[PDB]
Design a binder for this molecule. Structure first.
Ligand SMILES: O=C(O)Cc1ccc2c(c1)NC(=O)c1ccc(Cl)cc1N2
Length: 270
């Protein structure tokens, strides 16, 4: 079949390598093409992506090298970013946030199960497909924390300051999994309050001190109902050894609270 290998680049999706929306010449199938001018970092991204296969992880179709430029063929998520579903100082309806949080946990359970830590979980990196299914995106900062059933402790500073766990700023070494759990908690906070609680999780940050002192009558905590707030009290624990794990997040009362109706299906009467 001539021309199935040809894709037209029709619009920019994101920057930081650059990603463009590509449309197949014959089939009109939409894919995301990450264009990286290597001019090692992308080599690790391709190889971590080759290990991944999950409905809540951006699909990797392959890669092609044309000299100094790498082309990564990735799943196009038409719904855009979770960031744009968050209304400033408001958030989103609690049943929507619960559904997105369920899909975020399935994705993170998957990655941790194969020994992969994302290390930069934030709403900008959580993409939505045509049915608003959440997909974990960008494995550029991702790494292996478990190999041959042996855990390797991390020491490298990675992520985005409002989403990083406090042990990354206080300790030389730390476990990978509680770090991803913490960032998921900050994502949950943003979805339910439309604001970030602190610039960074340090004692020098008044908002972080107020949280450890349990001043929940202050924003963003005042905008959040008692049931998801009780979960955030278990996730946003300073000591990573005392912080709730994903198996226990899945047993939480709000996590299991019936809230959202299934996608509106066409129906007629009489
Ligand atoms: O087509 C559109 O404009 C909607 C849209 C907007 C932003 C994104 C996507 C889709 N989908 C995406 O898959 C996407 C891919 C890479 C990057 Cl860096 C950002 C993305 N976000």
């Amino acid at each position: 079949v001539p021309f199935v290998e040809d894709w037209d680049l029709v619009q920019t999706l994101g920057e930081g390598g650059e990603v463009q929306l590509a449309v197949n010449r014959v089939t009109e199938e939409a894919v995301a093409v990450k264009i990286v001018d290597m001019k090692e970092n992308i080599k690790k991204e391709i190889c971590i992506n080759k290990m991944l296969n999950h409905e809540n992880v951006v699909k990797f179709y392959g890669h092609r090298r044309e000299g100094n430029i790498q082309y990564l063929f990735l799943e196009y998520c038409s719904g855009g970013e979770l960031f744009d579903r968050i209304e400033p100082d408001i958030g989103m309806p609690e049943p929507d946030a619960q559904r997105f949080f369920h899909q975020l946990m399935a994705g993170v359970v998957y990655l941790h199960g194969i020994g992969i830590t994302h290390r930069d979980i934030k709403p900008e990196n959580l993409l939505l497909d045509e049915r608003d299914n959440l997909k974990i995106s960008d494995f550029g900062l991702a790494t292996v924390f478990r190999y041959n059933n042996r855990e390797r402790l991390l020491n490298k500073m990675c992520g985005t300051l409002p989403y990083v766990a406090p042990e990354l700023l206080k300790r030389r070494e730390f476990h990978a999994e509680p770090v991803d759990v913490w960032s998921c908690g900050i994502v949950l906070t943003a979805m339910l309050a439309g604001e970030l609680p602190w610039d960074q999780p340090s004692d020098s940050c008044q908002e972080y001190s107020d949280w450890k002192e349990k001043k929940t009558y202050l924003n963003p905590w005042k905008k959040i109902d008692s049931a998801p707030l009780a979960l955030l009290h278990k996730i946003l624990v300073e000591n990573p050894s005392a912080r709730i794990t994903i198996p226990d997040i899945k047993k939480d009362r709000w996590y299991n609270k019936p809230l959202k109706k299934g996608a509106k299906r066409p129906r007629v009467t009489s």
